[PDB]
Design an enzyme around this catalytic site. Structure first.
Site, PDB file in Angstrom:
ATOM      1  N   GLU A  28      -4.303  -8.084  -5.717  1.00 47.03           N
ATOM      2  CA  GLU A  28      -3.196  -8.794  -6.324  1.00 47.03           C
ATOM      3  C   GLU A  28      -1.821  -8.169  -6.231  1.00 47.03           C
ATOM      4  OE1 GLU A  28      -6.139  -8.208  -7.900  1.00 47.03           O
ATOM      5  OE2 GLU A  28      -6.987 -10.244  -7.749  1.00 47.03           O
ATOM      6  N   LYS A  68       3.051   6.354   5.407  1.00 48.46           N
ATOM      7  CA  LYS A  68       2.141   5.412   4.788  1.00 48.46           C
ATOM      8  C   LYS A  68       2.806   4.065   4.942  1.00 48.46           C
ATOM      9  CE  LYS A  68      -1.612   4.032   2.745  1.00 48.46           C
ATOM     10  NZ  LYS A  68      -1.457   2.843   3.637  1.00 48.46           N
ATOM     11  N   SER A  69       2.041   3.110   5.438  1.00 43.24           N
ATOM     12  CA  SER A  69       2.547   1.764   5.609  1.00 43.24           C
ATOM     13  C   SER A  69       1.898   0.769   4.647  1.00 43.24           C
ATOM     14  CB  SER A  69       2.336   1.318   7.048  1.00 43.24           C
ATOM     15  OG  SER A  69       0.950   1.187   7.336  1.00 43.24           O
ATOM     16  N   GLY A  70       2.466  -0.429   4.596  1.00 44.90           N
ATOM     17  CA  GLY A  70       1.922  -1.464   3.738  1.00 44.90           C
ATOM     18  C   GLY A  70       2.187  -2.823   4.341  1.00 44.90           C
ATOM     19  N   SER A  96       0.772  -1.238   0.000  1.00 40.58           N
ATOM     20  CA  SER A  96       0.000   0.000   0.000  1.00 40.58           C
ATOM     21  C   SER A  96       0.800   1.283   0.000  1.00 40.58           C
ATOM     22  CB  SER A  96      -0.995   0.022   1.158  1.00 40.58           C
ATOM     23  OG  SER A  96      -1.997  -0.959   0.938  1.00 40.58           O
TER      24      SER A  96
END
Length: 263
Positions: free
Chosen positions: A143, A209-211, A45
């Site tokens: 995906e 912002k993390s993912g 993300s």
């Protein structure tokens, strides 16, 4: 400071996986410290900040309007869409979608925005055009988090992501209004609490912002600094670990604690 590299290597030992790291000076763009700067890692993300930068570029060019309402249906909804699931019949404006994608991690909001700018192909072209020749988006939400080992789809390099974020937040790519809007969405980030924010001294500024993705993938991009002003960019990515989410989070926070200690 090399003491922070000690913590990055310690994280690799604890997670049994590769960790990429960059600390960049926001003003000059100089790389202060790095580990696997030019190895590829899944963006997850964290790509949403790049997406909204492309949207803002289009707003600056008069090709898009932040107040334009986008309508969608049940068919567009993908997993984890906290804000978009509540507005199926109201629709959402471009601005509300970027806020949802960045601050609340809404996946459907990201896919809707991707469509508006021309999809992964156009985001990749936008990045290449502003000087990032390695970051690439190839797929859509869920995906793009697949993180198949050695797959270059939907990846970036730590050094590239760091300079790209510096260009978007402080470079001449976006207008002053757009640069401020992008960092404001990042400063209101509400889902990266266990990461760098947990190691940030009171009074400091952070826009991040993390993912998270498959195969232990985890990462964060951030602009942070003392006295309520950002002065460095930090990028941390990892993939391949079989460790728990809490363990991965703890290791990223520890790297953050070290970079704050040796600031």
């Amino acid at each position: 400071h090399p003491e922070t590299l000690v913590k990055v290597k310690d994280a690799e030992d604890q997670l049994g996986a590769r960790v990429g790291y960059i600390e960049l000076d926001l003003n000059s763009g100089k790389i202060l410290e790095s580990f696997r700067p030019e190895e590829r890692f899944p963006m997850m993300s964290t790509f949403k900040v790049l997406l909204c930068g492309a949207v803002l570029s289009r707003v600056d060019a008069g090709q898009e309007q932040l107040g334009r309402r986008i309508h969608y249906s049940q068919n567009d909804l993908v997993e984890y869409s906290p804000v978009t699931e509540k507005h199926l019949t109201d629709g959402m404006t471009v601005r509300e979608l970027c806020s949802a994608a960045i601050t609340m991690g809404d996946n459907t909001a990201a896919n809707l925005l991707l469509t508006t700018i021309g999809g992964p192909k156009e985001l990749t072209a936008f990045l290449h055009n502003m000087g990032d020749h390695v970051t690439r988006l190839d797929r859509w939400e869920p995906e793009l988090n697949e993180a198949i080992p050695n797959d270059e789809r939907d990846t970036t390099m730590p050094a590239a992501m760091a300079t790209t974020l510096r260009k978007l937040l402080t470079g001449e790519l976006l207008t002053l209004a757009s640069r401020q809007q992008l960092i404001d969405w990042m400063e209101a980030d509400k889902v990266a609490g266990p990461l760098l924010r947990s190691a940030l001294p009171a009074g400091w500024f952070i826009a991040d912002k993390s993912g998270a993705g498959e195969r232990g993938s985890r990462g964060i991009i951030a602009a942070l600094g003392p006295d309520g002003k950002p002065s460095r960019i930090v990028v941390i990515y990892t993939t391949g670990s079989q460790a728990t989410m809490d363990e991965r989070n703890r290791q990223i926070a520890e790297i953050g604690a070290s970079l704050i200690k040796h600031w």
